[PDB]
């Protein structure tokens, strides 16, 4: 063929709602960042696990940034068509297991290939590999995280595809501990069908009909980064007085 059905009225509403949800929960001016505990950058040119763990100089700032981001994700998820139809128990399972992956996805909007930084930013609010090691993380997370960001940037997603990919990430029927996997799968399928149809209808050439499979592959990549973050957060958590440098929400979500 191959067939290019038009977006239904419902799929059109779904996309409008997700776009609106993202515009209300993602500030592209980063104007709240001055409210976070300030960034501190110690002398660590090369760049010492002992010193990084001793000082955790960027952790209060980046933990506030991540906590703030988790709050925005909860807000976004609440607006996903169908999410509120789930049990409060399943909503929380989905939120806590996807939070770090959605933060990695939504952070792509501040990421720039100009210098491979998340520029929120300023100079104070520009985050590089070395800022992330100053928060207690190691290259086994950071280097594939940068690779992931570049790979995602190069998909050149429409904002519609970006918000759908975040929604699909969150409403995933295979997360540990979900009860109503069938309901979650139904909601995800509706979103996935919307995304597939959108790409067919609206995405030039085509056939860049590998775009959907490239997007699904990013979801698998995110599971990997999630396991590695979990390992590294555990070792950060062993640092005496680390909990003062985090926040209640971060402690709960990642504990």
CB of 147 to ligand 90L, least distance (A): 13
- Binding stretches for ligand 90L (CB under 6 A): 26-27, 30, 62-63, 66, 69, 72, 103-104, 106-107, 109-110, 118, 120, 127, 132, 135, 229, 233, 250
| 23 annotated to a ligand binding site | no
| 209 annotated to a ligand binding site | no
Closest CA to 29 of 116, 121, 114: 121
CB of 27 to ligand 90L, least distance (A): 5
Give the nearer residue to ligand 90L in terms of CB position, either 27 or 227.
27
Give the Cα-Cα-Cα angle 95, 11, 21 (nearest 5 degrees). Answer: 40
Give the nearer residue to ligand 90L in terms of CB position, either 111 or 198.
111
CB of 123 to ligand 90L, least distance (A): 15
- Angle formed by the axes of helices 159-170 and 9-25, to 10°? 90
Give the nearer residue to ligand 90L in terms of CB position, either 62 or 94.
62
Helices (H) and strands (E) in the chain, counts: 11, 3
CB of 152 to ligand 90L, least distance (A): 12
Cα dihedral angle (150, 206, 202, 185), rounded to 10 degrees?
Answer: -70
Give dist(CA 246, CA 249) in Å, integer.
8
| 107 annotated to a ligand binding site | no
Give the nearer residue to ligand 90L in terms of CB position, either 63 or 170.
63
Residue 111 pairs in a beta bridge with: 118
Cα dihedral angle (77, 81, 86, 90), rounded to 10 degrees?
Answer: -30
Cα 29 vs. chain centroid, distance in angstroms?
18
Give dist(CA 251, CA 253) in Å, integer.
6
Give the nearer residue to ligand 90L in terms of CB position, either 109 or 221.
109
CB of 236 to ligand 90L, least distance (A): 6
Q: Annotated binding site, which residues?
A: 26, 69, 106, 110, 137, 229
Binding residues for calcitriol: 26, 69, 106, 110, 137, 229
């Amino acid at each position: 063929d191959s067939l290019r059905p038009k977006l239904s009225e419902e799929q059109q509403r779904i996309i409008a709602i997700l776009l609106d949800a993202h515009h209300k929960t993602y500030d592209p001016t980063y104007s709240d960042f001055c409210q976070f505990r300030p960034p501190v950058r110690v002398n660590d040119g090369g760049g010492s696990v002992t010193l990084e763990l001793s000082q955790l100089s960027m952790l209060p700032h980046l933990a506030d940034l991540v906590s703030y981001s988790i709050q925005k994700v909860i807000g976004f998820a609440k607006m996903i068509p169908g999410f509120r139809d789930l049990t409060s128990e399943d909503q929380i399972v989905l939120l806590k297991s996807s939070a770090i992956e959605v933060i990695m996805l939504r952070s792509n909007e501040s990421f720039t290939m100009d210098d491979m930084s998340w520029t929120c930013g300023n100079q104070d609010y520009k985050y590089r590999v070395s800022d992330v090691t100053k928060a207690g993380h190691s290259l086994e997370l950071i280097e594939p995280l940068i690779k992931f960001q570049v790979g995602l940037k190069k998909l050149n997603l429409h904002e519609e595809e970006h918000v759908l990919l975040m929604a699909i990430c969150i409403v995933s029927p295979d997360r540990p501990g979900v009860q109503d996997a069938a309901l979650i799968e139904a909601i995800q399928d509706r979103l996935s069908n919307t995304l597939q149809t959108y790409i067919r209808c609206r995405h030039p050439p085509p056939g860049s009909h590998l775009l959907y499979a490239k997007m699904i592959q990013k979801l698998a990549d995110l599971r990997s980064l999630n396991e590695e973050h979990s390992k590294q957060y555990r070792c950060l958590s062993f640092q005496p007085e680390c909990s003062m440098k985090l926040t209640p929400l971060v402690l709960e979500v990642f504990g």
